[PDB]
């Protein structure tokens, strides 16, 4: 993993771009690892980390979501890629377009024969000023559902202690969609959109924390 945690390689921190779609039997996390993108947290970080470790793959398939109505690909100076302002490779920061953020109601069927792992997030801006500024309305709201699950999140506007000069935060969530099931995203703001899904496998893979060098 070198400088990257599993979660950071997943999300697509620019310095972890080399990790895209790679597989492992054993992923090794170094104590020296650090994030250098937009500051984030993961509710139940340990479980997501765990399920990915066990799946043993970063294979990602891009999908064409219908984000008509909004501006896609929002970026930040806290997340530099090739010397320019960027964002997580696998995530899509949506903002208003022409001062509207229409309520999004976007669908994505799993018509595959395998499960899809979707990684998405909610942005918690540091001020109301940022709120109006990003989403052109005072309060965003996100509902992510399948036939067999639902995850509803209310953005929390407010300052957090600055991380790499950033007082705002993103909260990360995940959703598995079985074949025959459907991903539904209903949002009115603050959605950090997935660009697709990760494939999820089962097998002998795991993760270990260690600072021992790799030998031939």
């Amino acid at each position: 993993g070198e400088n990257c945690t599993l979660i950071d390689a997943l999300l697509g921190d620019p310095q972890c771009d080399g990790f895209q779609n790679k597989k492992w039997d054993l992923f090794v996390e170094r104590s020296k690892a650090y994030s250098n993108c937009y500051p984030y947290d993961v509710p139940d970080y340990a479980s997501l980390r765990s399920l990915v470790a066990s799946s043993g793959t970063l294979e990602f398939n891009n999908e064409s979501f219908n984000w008509t109505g909004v501006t896609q690909n929002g970026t930040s100076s806290a997340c530099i890629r090739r010397s320019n302002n960027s964002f997580f490779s696998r995530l899509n920061w949506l903002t208003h377009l022409n001062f509207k953020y229409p309520a999004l109601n976007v669908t994505m069927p799993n018509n595959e024969q395998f499960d899809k792992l979707y990684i998405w997030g909610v942005h918690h801006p540091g001020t109301d000023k940022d709120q109006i500024f990003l989403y052109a309305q005072s309060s965003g709201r996100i509902t992510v559902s399948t036939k067999r699950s639902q995850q509803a999140v209310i953005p929390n506007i407010g300052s957090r202690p600055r991380i790499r000069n950033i007082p705002s935060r993103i909260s990360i969530y995940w959703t598995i969609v079985k074949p025959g099931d459907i991903l539904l995203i209903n949002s009115t703001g603050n959605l950090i959109a997935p660009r697709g899904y990760f494939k999820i496998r089962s097998g002998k893979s795991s993760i270990m924390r260690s600072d021992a060098p790799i030998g031939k």
């Epitope: 690909n73 929002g74 100076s77």
Partner: antibody
Framework: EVQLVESGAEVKKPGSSVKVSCRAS???????INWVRQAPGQGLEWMGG????????NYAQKFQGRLTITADGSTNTAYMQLDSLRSEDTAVYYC?????????????????????????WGQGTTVTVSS | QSVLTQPPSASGTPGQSVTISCSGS????????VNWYQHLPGMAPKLLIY???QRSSGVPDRFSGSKSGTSASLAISGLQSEDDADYYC???????????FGGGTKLTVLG
């Protein structure tokens, strides 16, 4: 892509205030709208700019306290207001911005990052300051 | 004194070439891209060069921009009568927190 059209030529007595408008043919919100003037026999002079998407304004020191720039997104119109006018304020006033687009727009950056080379220009507004 | 220093004048005859220099400081040219403008009597300026060495849409490749250290240059070859104009450099200045222009160079094309 967008075209910029300014209000007509103006004349003001010393000590008064002038306001010039700058209407774009469509949304022009993401990048800095700059204001630049030319007095007769003088070089181009940067006065200031605003990055409308943020409302953030940057002003030249020479004009701080007497220049105010506004951007009203709802009508796609920008404005320059210069108070306490003197003879030195006689100039052609242009508004301008970039036709820049990006696959990905920055949401929390320093003001300088939204200022680019100006390839979209208004037709200019003649302002005369005289008693 | 403009923050960027340009010679007041430059000249050549048709088909010749010229280079116009633009000098600044660490706070401006050293850490920022350079823009170059052409200004003809009566009309708004037109952008020729941005990001120090990239040509604006429709501009022929006989206009070229460069920058190194704390100075920038606009070079013009194959001189034609219509290139006669005032030329301005510009960039962001990190100390003033704003854009600064050079004083301009009056280029004469002796057609």
């Amino acid at each position: 892509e967008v075209q910029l059209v300014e209000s007509g030529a103006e004349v003001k007595k010393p000590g008064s205030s002038v306001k010039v408008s700058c209407r774009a043919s469509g949304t022009f919100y993401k990048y800095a709208i700059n204001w630049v003037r030319q007095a007769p026999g003088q070089g181009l002079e940067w006065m200031g700019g605003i990055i409308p998407f943020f409302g953030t304004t940057n002003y030249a020191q020479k004009f701080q306290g007497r220049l105010t720039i506004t951007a009203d997104g709802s009508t796609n119109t920008a404005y320059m207001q210069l108070d306490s006018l003197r003879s030195e304020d006689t100039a052609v006033y242009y508004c301008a911005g970039p036709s820049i687009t990006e696959s990905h727009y920055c949401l929390d950056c320093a003001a300088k990052d939204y200022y680019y080379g100006l390839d979209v220009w208004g037709q200019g507004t003649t302002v005369t300051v005289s008693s | 004194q403009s923050v960027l220093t340009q010679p007041p004048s430059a000249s050549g005859t048709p088909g010749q070439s010229v280079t116009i220099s633009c000098s600044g400081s660490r706070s401006n040219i050293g850490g920022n891209t350079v823009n170059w403008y052409q200004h003809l009597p009566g009309m708004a300026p037109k952008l020729l060069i941005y990001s120090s060495n990239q040509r604006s849409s429709g501009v022929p490749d006989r206009f070229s921009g460069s920058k190194s250290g704390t100075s920038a240059s606009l070079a013009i070859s194959g001189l034609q009568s219509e290139d006669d104009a005032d030329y301005y450099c510009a960039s962001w200045d990190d100390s003033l927190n704003g854009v600064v222009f050079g004083g301009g160079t009056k280029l004469t094309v002796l057609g």
